[PDB]
Paper text:
Cytochrome c oxidase (CcO), the terminal oxidase in cellular respiration, couples O2 reduction to proton pumping. Mammalian CcO is located in the inner mitochondrial membrane and accepts electrons from cytochrome c in the intermembrane space (P-side). The protons used for H2O synthesis are supplied to the enzyme via the D-pathway and K-pathway from the matrix side (N-side), whereas pumping protons are transferred through the enzyme from the N-side to the intermembrane space (P-side) in order to generate a proton-concentration gradient across the mitochondrial inner membrane. Bovine CcO, a large transmembrane protein, exists as a 420 kDa dimer in its crystalline state.
In this study, we determined the structure of a reduced CcO crystal at neutral pH in order to compare the structural alterations that occur upon redox change at neutral pH and pH 5.7. The structure of reduced bovine CcO crystallized under neutral conditions (pH 7.3) was determined at 1.99 Å resolution. A peroxide anion detected at the dioxygen-reduction centre indicates that the reduced crystal contains oxidized CcO at a ratio of 0.20. The significant structural alterations that occurred following the redox change were restricted to the region around the magnesium-containing water cluster, whereas no other significant difference density was observed in peripheral regions. All water sites in the magnesium-containing water cluster were in almost the same positions as in the reduced state at pH 5.7. Subsequent to our previous studies, we determined the occupancies of water molecules in the magnesium-containing water cluster and found that the total number of water molecules was 20.40; this number is identical within experimental error to that in the oxidized crystal (21.15). Helix X of the oxidized and the reduced states at pH 7.3 superposed well onto those of the corresponding states at pH 5.7. The structures of helix X in the oxidized and reduced states were termed ‘closed’ and ‘open’ structures, respectively, in our previous paper. Interestingly, the B factors of residues 380–383 in the reduced states at both pH values are significantly higher than those of the other regions of helix X. In contrast, the oxidized structures at both pH values exhibit smooth distributions of B factors throughout helix X. These B-factor distributions indicate that residues 380–383 are highly flexible in the reduced state. The structural alterations detected at pH 5.7 to Asp51, the magnesium-containing water cluster, the haems and helix X upon redox change, which provide important structural evidence for the H-pathway proton-pumping mechanism, were reproduced at pH 7.3.
Author numbering:
A (entry chain A): 1 to 514
B (entry chain J): 1 to 58
C (entry chain I): 1 to 73
D (entry chain B): 1 to 227
E (entry chain L): 2 to 47
F (entry chain K): 6 to 54
G (entry chain M): 1 to 43
H (entry chain H): 7 to 85
Amino acid sequence: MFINRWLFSTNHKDIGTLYLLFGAWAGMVGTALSLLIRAELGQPGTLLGDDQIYNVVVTAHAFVMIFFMVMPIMIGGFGNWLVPLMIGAPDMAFPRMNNMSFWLLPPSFLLLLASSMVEAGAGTGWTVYPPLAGNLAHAGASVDLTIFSLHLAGVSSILGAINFITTIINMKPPAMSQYQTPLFVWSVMITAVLLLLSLPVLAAGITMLLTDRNLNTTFFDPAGGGDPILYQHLFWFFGHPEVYILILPGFGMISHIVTYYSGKKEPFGYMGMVWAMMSIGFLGFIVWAHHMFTVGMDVDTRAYFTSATMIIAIPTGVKVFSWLATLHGGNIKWSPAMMWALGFIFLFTVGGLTGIVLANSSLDIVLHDTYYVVAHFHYVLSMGAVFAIMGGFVHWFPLFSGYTLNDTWAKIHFAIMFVGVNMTFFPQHFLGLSGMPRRYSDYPDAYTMWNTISSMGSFISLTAVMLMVFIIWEAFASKREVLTVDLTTTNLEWLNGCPPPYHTFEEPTYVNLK
Amino acid sequence: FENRVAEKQKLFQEDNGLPVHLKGGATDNILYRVTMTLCLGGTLYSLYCLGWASFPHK
Amino acid sequence: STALAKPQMRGLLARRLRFHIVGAFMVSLGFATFYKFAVAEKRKKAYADFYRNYDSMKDFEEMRKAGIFQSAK
Amino acid sequence: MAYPMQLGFQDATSPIMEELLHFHDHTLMIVFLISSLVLYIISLMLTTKLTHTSTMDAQEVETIWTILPAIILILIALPSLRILYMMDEINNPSLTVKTMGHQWYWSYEYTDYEDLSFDSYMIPTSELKPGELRLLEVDNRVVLPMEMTIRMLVSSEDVLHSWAVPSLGLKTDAIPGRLNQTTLMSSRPGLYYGQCSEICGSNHSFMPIVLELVPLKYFEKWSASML
Amino acid sequence: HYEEGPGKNIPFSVENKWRLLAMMTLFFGSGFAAPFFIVRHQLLKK
Amino acid sequence: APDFHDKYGNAVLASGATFCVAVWVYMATQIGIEWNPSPVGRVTPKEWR
Amino acid sequence: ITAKPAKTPTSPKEQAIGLSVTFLSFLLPAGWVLYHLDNYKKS
Amino acid sequence: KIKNYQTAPFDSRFPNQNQTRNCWQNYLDFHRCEKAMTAKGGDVSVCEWYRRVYKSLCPISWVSTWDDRRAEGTFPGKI
Amino acid sequence: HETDEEFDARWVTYFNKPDIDAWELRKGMNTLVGYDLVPEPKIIDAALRACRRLNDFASAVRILEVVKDKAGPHKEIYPYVIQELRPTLNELGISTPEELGLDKV
Amino acid sequence: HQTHAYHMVNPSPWPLTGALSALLMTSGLTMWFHFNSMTLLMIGLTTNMLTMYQWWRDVIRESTFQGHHTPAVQKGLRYGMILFIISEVLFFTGFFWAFYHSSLAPTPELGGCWPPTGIHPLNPLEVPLLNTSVLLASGVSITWAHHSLMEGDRKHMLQALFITITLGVYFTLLQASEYYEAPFTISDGVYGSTFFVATGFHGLHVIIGSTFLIVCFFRQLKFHFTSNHHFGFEAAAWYWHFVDVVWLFLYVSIYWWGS
Amino acid sequence: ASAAKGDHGGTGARTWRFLTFGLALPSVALCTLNSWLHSGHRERPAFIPYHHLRIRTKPFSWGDGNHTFFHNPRVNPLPTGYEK
Amino acid sequence: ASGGGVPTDEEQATGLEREVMLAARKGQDPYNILAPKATSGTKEDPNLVPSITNKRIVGCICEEDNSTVIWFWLHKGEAQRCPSCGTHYKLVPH
Amino acid sequence: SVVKSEDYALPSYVDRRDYPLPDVAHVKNLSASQKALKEKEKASWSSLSIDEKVELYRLKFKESFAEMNRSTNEWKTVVGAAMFFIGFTALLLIWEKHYVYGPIPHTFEEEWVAKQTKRMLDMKVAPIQGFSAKWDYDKNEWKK
Ligand SMILES: CCCCCCCCCCCCCCCCCC(=O)OCC(COC(=O)CCCCCCCCCCCCCCCCC)OC(=O)CCCCCCCCCCCCCCCCC
Ligand code: HEA
Ligand SMILES: CCCCC/C=C\C/C=C/C/C=C\C/C=C\CCCC(=O)O[C@H](COC(=O)CCCCCCCCCCCCCCCCC)COP(=O)(O)OCCN
Ligand SMILES: CCCCCC/C=C\CCCCCCCCCC(=O)O[C@H](COC(=O)CCCCCCCCCCCCCCC)COP(=O)(O)OC[C@@H](O)CO
Ligand SMILES: CCCCCCCCCCO[C@@H]1O[C@H](CO)[C@@H](O[C@H]2O[C@H](CO)[C@@H](O)[C@H](O)[C@H]2O)[C@H](O)[C@H]1O
Ligand code: CUA
Ligand SMILES: [Cu+2]
Ligand SMILES: [Mg+2]
Ligand code: NA
Ligand code: NA
Ligand SMILES: [Zn+2]
């Protein structure tokens, strides 16, 4: 029975639960790696005495947080749990292929850990640029294990994307048009389209790197007429859509959380929110070379990428102002999930605005490959994704588990986290403006003060993470069972109780056309 | 060839509680066991290979 | 005693919003300059004042005499 | 170079860097305006017991939310692209210098007239002379004539590197098989520091760049003596 | 069929809070510990 | 009936604040952390050549 | 949300134990590694 | 004529950041010129300009590699 | 989009329906408090008399509470509304939340 | 009992065996590339084939034998196949991008020309043209197969499908021969790299497509397909058209324009 | 374009078979004939050890590590030239 | 030129596929493939909601093109009303 | 009173200032005296005593508006506990400084810094605003 249920699952809820467990475990790995980064930088000099190991830690930090924590939690975890419930569907379109998307991830993670254990690891950056990642500067198995890890994660998400698109297009009640589906469902749909188109380009690029490393191809090797810059194009052609992939389900959860704790039946300007996510998804495919402003590109190309990149602020602003307009006139409930969402809105805005600074290629010359970029994305991506994830987790924990969290503990956790992340990352703006490069194990002495503060901040967030674990333990230890949930009329995922039965919507909802 | 779909329909719709991957009979069980044994054995061997490869032979 | 006068009862939220968005804007436009006057104009003046009578050769000589250069003793 | 507790950019050494400073001021002003507006509005939304929970009409307010940000972006893009195209203009250099990235050091070639080339390595911490800067000093500095337009050509003989000098506003990736061009002009004599700005392996942190800017006559004699 | 309801729709037992504590400790603890031991491993290689 | 916060709130606030300030002040000033603040108005420049 | 009182209440004492055990599960192994860093290099 | 050579002048054929082709073209031009001049028993020194330009622009290792490959019979450009 | 007077008249008519049922009373009040307004005394009067026809004293008191609540920090609104309603309160024997001690925390 | 039309699938081991086969194939390629050994890889390939066989077997059992493929379930599979094909198009796009990047700006190492110095391209008017006529012909014969099936014609469906498969095999054998005859190799710089990787992935897809057609052929032999319900056939046909079109882009870009 | 054929009355199996046997397979037969004449060995290219060709950055994982997967002794020289 | 040998759905469709096919021929929708058309939704003319049990979730799109759907359990017994628009629904078990 | 898990699909009671009249009464079952009170409620409400009026209210509703909207001392616990854990973090940082970190480079020694400071002024580091601009080269001191 255990094996049938947990290894052979064809159930969207159980598979969602598997993803959440996987993602939580990955979050602990990614967090440990981040602390090692900040420990090395916490005082001037060397802590590890081995900068190849430093670079391996940085590289793994990124892959773990992106591919094993964020994507599995948002798309695999919340997507699987919530999407079928929110459209009254009995499961995903391909419930068995769904299970393979999950089971591909532990082997993918195993390949990443193998890369770090063999030889000297892959000390490449999560970008894995040749020639550093090539077979001369990184001889041996590490980089190939990294490529294979990415292959498996790629296949997992591509099949997942096919599953979500099909489910969302095909499995709504017959009367429900796409313009009657909740925003989170939209956000998963759009994310899945981005995955479907972008991951195969990455797969092509890393396959070419694999063949350069093992089959004597020279796609990226000038000796054979290749070009290291070609790899960068292929990687970032995936890599920009990827950053939008990482935030979109977050925007979706934020819309639900803000609506809910404002006591509203609906988000402000639903069609504008749909429009904004689609526009962001589209524009996300035409801006990638803003990651390459220093590689030696022509001026007109730089002017174009600067302009196209800035335009994304417009639909994004529509979403930010619509969240504010959702709060407007709300009966505000200061739940822990609401606090996460409010934190998300402001931290995402800060990071988005530093993105606009970076979009300007002239300024990016001086800011590229400095801590200003690291600060930008830890606000918009790291805080944005994590705050949306924590908001969604606290909000829907009682749905998934049937048990309540202690709200006071959860508020304490939010408070510690808010202080920690801002102490960690805010000073990194100063480090970047003043010229400290990223991907460094040590820094000229002038940079000591901000690096010291930033590392102290990282320990504060460690305390918050440890507390998060205790809080989840306390919920399961105490077993306060859910009774009534407000606003079920506009939050269908709650209407089958907590937790919902294994099989829901065996009899589908009735929705007439009028 | 004769159309024997109706016979297969009867076999696979028999009310015997068996999951589809075992509903053909004893041969399904064998093929399943072979597959899972190769997968689990191969996975253990991959772990061994990792252990071996994680250490230098200077 | 006397009766209480009839107060405004409608659009209290919208009226609050109308009032404060002007204040939200006026901070901005009132502030606008703070970064502008205290940072931007200060910076333009610092660069203008520095270079107005700047003598690069004299600057070099002071550096040379202080012993900082590999190429110039 | 950076100094302790620095918040913003290193002081500009070139006119283009001065332009970047004022453009950053302009943009950051706008960034502060927006972030504060958002913070203010958020607090406003959250500080009243008054409620209005029925359906609100979206289209009127969405015009403002789209048009004003569009205008703001144009107000950033206009000076942004002015500087971009000024950076790109033809300037006629008096001198060409090449730099080749290596693991982990820079080499320099000045081959307009004679074959002058040398390697440039970080001074190890244990060998710093009193008052010298940890991780920043090199054995052989890039000596260059001040107040002159210099063409820098940047490449690599192994992995990617990136040749940067923040106070001149310079960062040009060093790519094997490719010859990237940038222009360099210092308004002042002195020493101007930079660091490798593409991850190139285990000593990425330890291959800095030091420019030494002096009068032409000194540059010429130094050049001759370096043959 | 399967057990349904709170504490039953999960692959781990919550029947005893102390056994649960031990399991959550091993689970999150192994994930957090792993990078430190990978670093130790790499340092010990030379 | 008074809840947890009614009974212990004042004490948790007071002790929490006192403990936090004391330990951070101690960590910041007493254990040899080198913050490397600006030389400006602090350091007397000394002959190096 | 409303909920039932805890089926198996977790007292302040039990919370202190769960919290302490949790923090130690993160701190001790990492602490052990970091404390012995110099031993790993000098080996 | 244009002695007082300082450095390679701007070339409108190669106005962008990537100057690889500029170095390459001048290298080719110099050696083609030298070969054409020697074939006709003429003054090689009319080719000098291209040598100055490619010497200014081209990394030493590229020139050196190209020279080795011309001597080896493996230079892939047409001369 | 109709005057204030037309809005009020519609609502008065809503609650004045002789055979208004419990569901329609709840629907009315719960919808009305979603708007950016404190309902005029004449709306509330009509809603209170509906409570009377529905033999529901408690809902009458609750309606008075929600009037106070919708006014937010505008402390002058509720005492004014109660003032205007006093003849109805007296006629129907409706005690205010305050008179019942239901304003105590 | 359900009153929707969707398929609740029996708990299945094949996702896990599939995932493990992926681990075994990738760790196996690693072992092959670095530790001079083929064992893990061979086990991975074997378990992969076993997984695919039993998984698709079960899909056939679920549909032909158990009747779970209602119109709503079939429609889902249509979207699924279309989306899979789109992902495969983008995969090839990355290789076409690599080809155009290299060939439009040939570096000095190549002689600054395309095709590079020392490269003697195949004549696109010889076997590559034959290949083109073969796959185009196979697009015509597969359409004949589809119409015969819809018209209830068992014999002509089988004949047309057999012809299509024979053409697939012919292309595959022609390509294997051309690979052997080619005077340039995968190690001949970016020309060899782009040529063999792009046409090689295409060749793999031709093999996959041919196999899928063969599966349909044997299912047809066994009367699985009705004149109205035959999604496995549709789809093998879509995938086959996809493979044809990729060929046409390869022929135009690499063989013709890049010669 | 309408090709130059011109059928359409009902798009059926008969029409597609007509196209298979009347156009598609005859084109293949023609191209097959065409190939069967321009077949035969084109002379093997003289060996020049160009550095952009015969790339070896890592030995191949088969044979002696120096032979490509579809190595053809007649036309594929090694880095050191044609095999003896 | 053209014989038979290919089975039809009528001859060979089985299980749920066959049920759906046979019910569609009768103009029936027991597996909820079609959106039901609304009545006037008064208490006299309620929307009739079939169910195989004693309760079923209703989603009410109160006005055409509303993006917000209003969801509630409809129980066996007297007609219930949408909490947003008041339109009436009544469960008809089976 | 007693709400059960298996009742999730039924209309439920809630106290919410934006939903004043919930779908069901707080108290569903009535005792003999409570039944008599509901009968009395059908006659003039002026004949009801204050206690009877309160009892009728409490049958219909759980908490009053004033009760459900009351402020709490929770913020004290939240802020205090947050500060406690932030304080606990400094203990980990003290441990790290003592047991993990070794000495920082010699370049942070006071004499080094003084010499390096002079050399930075000699090379006129950030002479427009940042560093050397704050040094008075005439009076040989930091500007006031
Ligand atoms: C952490 C250490 C801070 C140290 C600050 C040094 C003091 C200035 C020296 C006192 C002045 C001494 C004279 C030196 C002037 C040098 C100025 C310069 O040459 O260069 C320019 C400087 C100028 O910047 C500053 O001048 C820093 C001010 C910080 C901006 C406001 C953020 C809130 C305050 C920060 C502390 C909280 C941290 C939590 C982070 C919060 C996230 C924003 O460098 C930057 O570009 C900073 C990059 C920030 C870009 C992100 C946008 C942030 C938007 C958020 C608004 C929040 C609303 C407040 C309301 C906030 C409520 C939440
Ligand atoms: C969540 C993930 C995420 C998101 C959403 C974004 C959003 C954006 N990012 Fe970011 N970014 C990353 C994650 C993300 N980023 C990562 C991981 C990297 C580096 C990877 C690496 O190198 O390892 C990166 C790097 C990166 C670079 C490259 C810098 C460099 O390496 O030199 C650039 C440059 O243009 C960029 C720009 C932008 C812009 C313009 C947006 C915009 O979409 C933001 C739009 C939002 C706002 C502007 C705020 C809200 C709007 C309003 C309140 C309206 C009014 C505002 C205005 C009118 C301005 N980012
Ligand atoms: C008739 C055409 C059909 C092709 C069938 C041939 C077998 C190879 C397999 C095909 C798969 C194609 C892509 C793999 C890339 C390389 C093979 C390219 C095709 C090929 O077969 O190229 C051959 C070289 O093969 C070689 O290296 C052999 C190397 C074989 C090992 C391949 C390494 C595995 C690559 C991993 C694939 C990653 C997949 C990613 C999936 C995406 C996940 C999202 C050419 O021979 P040659 O002697 O150099 O030149 C001819 C000289 N007479
Ligand atoms: C050297 C080779 C090694 C590489 C490994 C790959 C090997 C080859 C695999 C060949 C693909 C075989 C797929 C066979 C699927 C058979 C099952 C099937 O076709 O199932 C059909 C449904 O379609 C469905 O699931 C559709 C399922 C579609 C499957 C998609 C096939 C493409 C798979 C490609 C996989 C790798 C590609 C990526 C490579 C980089 C069943 O419905 P019907 O047909 O309507 O029948 C019902 C009627 O009888 C009722 O009257
Ligand atoms: C980035 C992550 C941050 C982690 C912060 C860690 C905070 C500290 C947790 C305690 O860790 C323990 O510290 C002891 C020292 O205090 C170590 O004992 C060591 O030192 C003792 C005293 O010298 C000896 O008794 C022991 O044998 C010797 O193992 C012990 O191994 C280690 O587990
Ligand atoms: Cu060289 Cu980084
Ligand atoms: Cu991007
Ligand atoms: Mg870079
Ligand atoms: Na360090
Ligand atoms: Na068909
Ligand atoms: Zn309705």
